[PDB]
Amino acid sequence: IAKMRTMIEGFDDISHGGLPIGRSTLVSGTSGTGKTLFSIQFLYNGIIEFDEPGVFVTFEETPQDIIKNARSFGWDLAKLVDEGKLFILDALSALIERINYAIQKYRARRVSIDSVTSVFQQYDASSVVRRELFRLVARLKQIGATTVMTTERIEEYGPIARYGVEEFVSDNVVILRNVLEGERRRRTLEILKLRGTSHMKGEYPFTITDHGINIFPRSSNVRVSSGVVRLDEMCGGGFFKDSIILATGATGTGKTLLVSRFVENACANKERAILFAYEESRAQLLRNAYSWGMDFEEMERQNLLKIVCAYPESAGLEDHLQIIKSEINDFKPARIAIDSLSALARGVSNNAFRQFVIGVTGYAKQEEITGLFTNTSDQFMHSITDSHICVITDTIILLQYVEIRGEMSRAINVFKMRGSWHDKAIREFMISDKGPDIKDSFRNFERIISGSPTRI
Amino acid sequence: IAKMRTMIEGFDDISHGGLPIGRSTLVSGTSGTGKTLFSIQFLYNGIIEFDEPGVFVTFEETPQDIIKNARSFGWDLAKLVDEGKLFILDALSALIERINYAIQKYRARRVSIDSVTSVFQQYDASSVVRRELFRLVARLKQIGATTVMTTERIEEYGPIARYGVEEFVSDNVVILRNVLEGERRRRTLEILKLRGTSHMKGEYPFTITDHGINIFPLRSSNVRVSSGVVRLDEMCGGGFFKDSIILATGATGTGKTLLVSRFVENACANKERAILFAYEESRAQLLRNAYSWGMDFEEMERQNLLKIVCAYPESAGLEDHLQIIKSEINDFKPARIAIDSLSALARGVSNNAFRQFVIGVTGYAKQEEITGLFTNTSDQFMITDSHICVITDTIILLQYVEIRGEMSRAINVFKMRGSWHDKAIREFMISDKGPDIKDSFRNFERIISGSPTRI
Amino acid sequence: IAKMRTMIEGFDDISHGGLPIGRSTLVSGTSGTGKTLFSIQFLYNGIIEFDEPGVFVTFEETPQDIIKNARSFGWDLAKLVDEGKLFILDALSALIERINYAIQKYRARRVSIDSVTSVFQQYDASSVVRRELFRLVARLKQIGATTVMTTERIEEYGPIARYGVEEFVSDNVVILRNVLEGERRRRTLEILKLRGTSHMKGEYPFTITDHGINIFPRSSNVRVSSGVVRLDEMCGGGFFKDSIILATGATGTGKTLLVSRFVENACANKERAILFAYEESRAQLLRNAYSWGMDFEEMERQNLLKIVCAYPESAGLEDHLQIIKSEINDFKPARIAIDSLSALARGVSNNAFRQFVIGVTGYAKQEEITGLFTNTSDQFMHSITDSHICVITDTIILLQYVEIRGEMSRAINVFKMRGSWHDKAIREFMISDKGPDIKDSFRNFERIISGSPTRI
Ligand SMILES: Nc1ncnc2c1ncn2[C@@H]1O[C@H](COP(=O)(O)OP(=O)(O)OP(=O)(O)O)[C@@H](O)[C@H]1O
Ligand SMILES: Nc1ncnc2c1ncn2[C@@H]1O[C@H](COP(=O)(O)OP(=O)(O)OP(=O)(O)O)[C@@H](O)[C@H]1O
Ligand SMILES: Nc1ncnc2c1ncn2[C@@H]1O[C@H](COP(=O)(O)OP(=O)(O)OP(=O)(O)O)[C@@H](O)[C@H]1O
Ligand SMILES: Nc1ncnc2c1ncn2[C@@H]1O[C@H](COP(=O)(O)OP(=O)(O)OP(=O)(O)O)[C@@H](O)[C@H]1O
Numbered sequence A, C: 001i002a003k004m005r006t007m008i009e010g011f012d013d014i015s016h017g018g019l020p021i022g023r024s025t026l027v028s029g030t031s032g033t034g035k036t037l038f039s040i041q042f043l044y045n046g047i048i049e050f051d052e053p054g055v056f057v058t059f060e061e062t063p064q065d066i067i068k069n070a071r072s073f074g075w076d077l078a079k080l081v082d083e084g085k086l087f088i089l090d091a092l093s094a095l096i097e098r099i100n101y102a103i104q105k106y107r108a109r110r111v112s113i114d115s116v117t118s119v120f121q122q123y124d125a126s127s128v129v130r131r132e133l134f135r136l137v138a139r140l141k142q143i144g145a146t147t148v149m150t151t152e153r154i155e156e157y158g159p160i161a162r163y164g165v166e167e168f169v170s171d172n173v174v175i176l177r178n179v180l181e182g183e184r185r186r187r188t189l190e191i192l193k194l195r196g197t198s199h200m201k202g203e204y205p206f207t208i209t210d211h212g213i214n215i216f217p218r219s220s221n222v223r224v225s226s227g228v229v230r231l232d233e234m235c236g237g238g239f240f241k242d243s244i245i246l247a248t249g250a251t252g253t254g255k256t257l258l259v260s261r262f263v264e265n266a267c268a269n270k271e272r273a274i275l276f277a278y279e280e281s282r283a284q285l286l287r288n289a290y291s292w293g294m295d296f297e298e299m300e301r302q303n304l305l306k307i308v309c310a311y312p313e314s315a316g317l318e319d320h321l322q323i324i325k326s327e328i329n330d331f332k333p334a335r336i337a338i339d340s341l342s343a344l345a346r347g348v349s350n351n352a353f354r355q356f357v358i359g360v361t362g363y364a365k366q367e368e369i370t371g372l373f374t375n376t377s378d379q380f381m382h383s384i385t386d387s388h389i390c391v392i393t394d395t396i397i398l399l400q401y402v403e404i405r406g407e408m409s410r411a412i413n414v415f416k417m418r419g420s421w422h423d424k425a426i427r428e429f430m431i432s433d434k435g436p437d438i439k440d441s442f443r444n445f446e447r448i449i450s451g452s453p454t455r456i
Numbered sequence B: 001i002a003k004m005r006t007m008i009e010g011f012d013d014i015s016h017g018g019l020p021i022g023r024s025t026l027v028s029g030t031s032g033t034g035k036t037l038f039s040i041q042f043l044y045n046g047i048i049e050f051d052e053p054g055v056f057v058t059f060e061e062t063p064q065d066i067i068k069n070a071r072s073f074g075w076d077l078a079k080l081v082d083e084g085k086l087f088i089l090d091a092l093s094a095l096i097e098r099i100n101y102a103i104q105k106y107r108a109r110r111v112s113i114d115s116v117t118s119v120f121q122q123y124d125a126s127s128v129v130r131r132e133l134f135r136l137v138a139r140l141k142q143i144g145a146t147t148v149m150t151t152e153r154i155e156e157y158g159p160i161a162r163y164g165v166e167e168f169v170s171d172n173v174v175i176l177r178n179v180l181e182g183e184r185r186r187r188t189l190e191i192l193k194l195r196g197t198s199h200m201k202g203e204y205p206f207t208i209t210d211h212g213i214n215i216f217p218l219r220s221s222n223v224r225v226s227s228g229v230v231r232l233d234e235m236c237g238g239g240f241f242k243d244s245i246i247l248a249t250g251a252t253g254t255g256k257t258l259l260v261s262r263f264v265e266n267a268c269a270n271k272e273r274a275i276l277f278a279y280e281e282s283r284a285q286l287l288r289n290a291y292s293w294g295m296d297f298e299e300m301e302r303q304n305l306l307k308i309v310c311a312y313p314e315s316a317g318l319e320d321h322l323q324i325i326k327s328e329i330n331d332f333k334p335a336r337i338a339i340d341s342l343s344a345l346a347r348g349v350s351n352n353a354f355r356q357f358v359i360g361v362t363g364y365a366k367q368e369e370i371t372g373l374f375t376n377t378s379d380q381f382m383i384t385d386s387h388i389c390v391i392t393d394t395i396i397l398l399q400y401v402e403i404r405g406e407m408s409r410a411i412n413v414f415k416m417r418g419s420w421h422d423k424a425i426r427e428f429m430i431s432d433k434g435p436d437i438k439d440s441f442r443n444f445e446r447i448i449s450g451s452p453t454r455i
């Protein structure tokens, strides 16, 4: 069973090439799940790469309404119909005749029906839909044309179709969802089945952007500097180039300080860098940064630093990824920084957050980009990690508060360093008007990893 | 009631021999559960295993599509007509006649109907369905031919059939599921009932492969093997046991992958095949860190001795991961394997679904005399273990020890099943040639806390 | 209201003698709940003990199909019909006439209808079923014949009957269930009501075995040895004969060691013993046992030791009990051992597990059998007990890991000893190639029950 590519980033790897060739694919889902976006996108791409003639059988929508909406991603469907490359059939057993006729005058390639459920309200009685659905499918499989049929749905976790008898007739079943969890919508695609072929089971986080659908399913010894000399000395030549560094610690420990010095160092060696902040804003960052003797405003004047400030609850976790991606595909920084993940995990599913970290890490390492992700710990004085995904990070620079003689002092230590030597000493440090000052470690103190020390 | 082997791996143990002789079995479930697959496999295996006639009754789609769908597993229609061993009937009491025809025509034994739910569009009443259901099975039983019926379902945890009156008429009820939990689907088969016979109660994890369905049901020599480290072998009093399961738990960056790299290296060193299942790092990374310790993993794969199967834990489901391991070991056939790690496969997974995984790998690994070293990154570094350290025969736990404001690491053989081991928590270090197990801490107390005390 | 015995192990004590005499009993439940198994079992037993004439009114099942299925437990229904002791009436107001006629030619005793729901699909409309059900019941109560009526069900926790009007007509209501919790089926029986009589309320764990249905609703000073001399010295003459001993402790403490020495001691005094293992297999056990100088293979050669290895998730908790019972009813060991309960409680209901422990304990003590049950603790260094059923055990031999001068040493202490003196000292012990070596206790150490000790 040969498959037909749809040029839809994600769907090509989820269905292993695409959808069963010469067969009909049913795409069900609720309203605003992207049933039409996918439908025309299956034709557009098809009639832009392999130069294939595709006909669109519209029903409750006007042939200009479809083209007026496709202009949201800069798609000129008029120019498609101005070269006989796309035919829109405006709309009981005579409909297949016109489709069979049009497709004959437009050499059978890609066909989309939006929607079949619409022209079935006057029939109903469940058993009737199936009887008239089977005939349609069969009538298309005889002409051997990769057809996508749209179906309506009432529930996001209930009947597959309105009359629950379309999935049993259809050979291939793709379900588009828009689940709302904690007053936040999440678009997820899934391939229920695919007769005489293989596919990726379960649902994968996707979104609709200005390019349309966006479905989301080396290791050199090159070392880079973190901005701090002693830190690179503790890491035995600084952080690795293509690696993920983690800055875990309590509130006001110096995470954003290390991020600022990590981004500065990039711009210092004429290297581009992106800073994704979710806790503070450009205004505050510039002031805080300048207070340590760093010109963040100037760093952006050289087109070497970009600041993307936004709230962690502003958009969805499946969205935030796309922003980072598009932000990296444009500016093309050598290294990025996330401040912070703690803010991107608050009121989010433990699994939904795991898919995010895996995404950034993968993409960050896939493009050989150095990413310094910070994480704020709950207990300031310390268990381990909430979702404990410290196994994804190659380096772990944790900061801990140390109470010494009624003085709230801070300490830094390189907890982990994959395929690299590091200092296993909890060196004390302080903050000044020029960044960190890592001094000597606490040799005459015991139980330093348990908030409070002990005289020796 | 005579059994009938279907040659479906797992099913012949779940149904105790297979399905009842000259009885009608009902296989209900949702769409994509694998109802048609089972139906074909039942006849296919039955045809090329005991030269038995098979009659497939189609209803929804045509004989060509069904024949064109089995090509995904490598099954051809050479029995369809080129051997007259596969009779397909394209599609109330007139159907039964045609059924008895091909049956007595080719001295039939096996029969599959797919689907019967599609022949009850008009009849919107359960009364009619039951009446015309019983008559079918009753007829089929009069001919005493092992027939499999297929029905459709709306919910995975609701009515048995579409009209909920088919399981009561049917003698044997099989239910195929495709439950979706946490954006992840899991195919599970269960034998609801089986009249005048015994079977296994509850649902068993299965998958669909290119050999079709793979249902998953539910020695001890003193030969020792080297762990890669000499002191470690001395700590186990002769090295690791051959046909045994070793576990390495500890905080992130304790050196689990280090002990794995040496455990796999030692294999290839003695010209022994070993498989490495990574779910945290990738080949590129592992090769770098490995070489940094003075180990050439690339070379090890150049001699067809070491294999690396990197895959994100979240990529596939727990049931698929198992099949991937089994098939991977069925091809390469290593003398020992290593999983890095179990903790990476226990993330956003049910404790019951995870238990079934560890039991499988352990069982299968222990069933083929394969030495397995599974790692498990402990959540709270510097307590217990909310899982199963009872399954593992050996436990090599690594713990971080803070001494004089220095993040030092220690190792100890926590347990060694039916063997002597060192009961001392000796400090160790990592260099550019592997571990260096030094001496323990005699003048330090509460070393299990992660923070000792000057004695 | 006199009751009629059914000779069904469990149902006789649940309904206090049996079911209301001269009245009709409705048995509802889903498919494969054992509606037919019970139905014929009510006749078989009845026409095998009190020599009573019973007629079976079958519907959607053939008179040979019922007999062909009853042969799963070795029941010759043909021989029952070959002496006019059982009559099968193969199958609107004329059905009661034949039943009234047959029962007259087969002196009214035990009657079973399987099923009434079957011959009602052509009626439906809820109110119709009741009207035609009442007439049936009344027509049977007039002939005074203990009749059991089978009813179909869709839900395990929903309507009592298909039309939910059969329980209001029927005098007695028995509901058979097959609940699925965590991909595991559990058969439970219940008596909803019983007019003019008393019964046991709630549902009781049952199973179907080769004997059919299996519903599951002294104290001498005789002392026995545990295999260890010092252990018997710490128990002041060894464990009590008819008592339950518990071996709680962390992983690799020496639980299976004490079990092996406890089973060996039985075979040593020419006493039979059963070992129920769920963590290891015969292969490993024999090797581990032989490493301590115990010949487990030989112990089975004398027909004094039996090993029943099986996984704790292989079968159901309500099943595992039956296995132990049948295993003890055959071999008839003087003492048994369970290794372990921790494995039999993983992914099980806290209450469902409580009913198991009570079962083994009761049966173990009911047959005056000594049972050494082991339990693995979670924290290796220790709170108390998960489901804390240490109140069921008469003796508690807990083992605890003790870290001494960077050496992971082990310790044993007799925590409890009901109606017996015991040693209240945490004696240290080690393992060798001949079993345990209990030495002196830790006198110069403090906080030994909190993992880590303290110099004194
Ligand atoms: N240019 C755009 N940029 C971002 N999101 C867009 C853009 N255009 C549309 N969308 C999003 O995608 C949706 C359009 O999806 P589409 O029209 O295919 O829905 P549908 O599922 O076919 O709806 P219906 O059930 O009414 O037919 C919009 O509602 C909006 O959420
Ligand atoms: N080669 C293959 N590799 C992997 N999975 C496959 C392969 N071939 C088929 N499958 C899987 O098995 C499914 C086929 O099952 P099958 O065609 O029997 O469905 P079904 O349950 O009979 O559906 P229906 O409700 O339409 O009768 C596909 O949807 C896919 O999930
Ligand atoms: N100009 C300055 N001089 C001295 N110390 C400073 C100065 N500016 C900031 N600090 C110190 O360093 C800390 C700043 O660290 P930073 O702002 O990076 O916090 P953080 O660890 O990222 O915390 P969070 O993100 O939770 O607010 C302040 O709490 C203060 O102790
Ligand atoms: N010999 C046996 N050993 C063990 N279990 C058996 C044996 N025979 C039958 N069983 C079990 O008991 C069931 C038989 O129960 P029975 O036929 O009474 O069901 P039922 O509830 O009457 O079904 P229906 O609703 O279809 O009439 C089988 O499905 C199986 O689970």
Ligand SMILES: Nc1ncnc2c1ncn2[C@@H]1O[C@H](COP(=O)(O)OP(=O)(O)OP(=O)(O)O)[C@@H](O)[C@H]1O
Binding pocket: A390, A391, A392, A393, A415, A416, A417, A418, A419, A420, A421, A422, B250, B251, B252, B253, B254, B255, B256, B257, B258, B259, B280, B289, B292, B293, B377, B430, B431, B432
């Ligand atoms: N070349 C090297 N030289 C010195 N020490 C090294 C070297 N490579 C690794 N290490 C040490 O070993 C640690 C990594 O060991 P390893 O990756 O096996 O640990 P792990 O517990 O499996 O980690 P993770 O939780 O990330 O899987 C580093 O943190 C460092 O302390």
Ligand SMILES: Nc1ncnc2c1ncn2[C@@H]1O[C@H](COP(=O)(O)OP(=O)(O)OP(=O)(O)O)[C@@H](O)[C@H]1O
Binding pocket: B389, B390, B414, B415, B416, B417, B418, B419, B420, B421, C249, C250, C251, C252, C253, C254, C255, C256, C257, C258, C279, C288, C291, C292, C376, C431, C432, C433
């Ligand atoms: N031949 C031997 N010589 C010395 N010590 C041994 C020998 N065999 C086993 N041991 C020791 O005794 C322990 C065995 O105890 P046992 O196997 O009964 O463990 P357990 O407490 O039942 O643990 P679990 O059931 O959780 O695996 C081993 O961990 C080891 O310390």
Ligand SMILES: [Mg+2]
Binding pocket: A035, A036, A037, A114
């Ligand atoms: Mg639309």
Ligand SMILES: [Mg+2]
Binding pocket: A255, A256, A257, A279, A339
């Ligand atoms: Mg900050």
Ligand SMILES: [Mg+2]
Binding pocket: B035, B036, B037, B114
């Ligand atoms: Mg099918």
Ligand SMILES: [Mg+2]
Binding pocket: B256, B257, B280, B340
């Ligand atoms: Mg690792």
Ligand SMILES: [Mg+2]
Binding pocket: C035, C036, C037, C114
């Ligand atoms: Mg029955």
Ligand SMILES: [Mg+2]
Binding pocket: C255, C256, C257, C279, C339
């Ligand atoms: Mg044990």
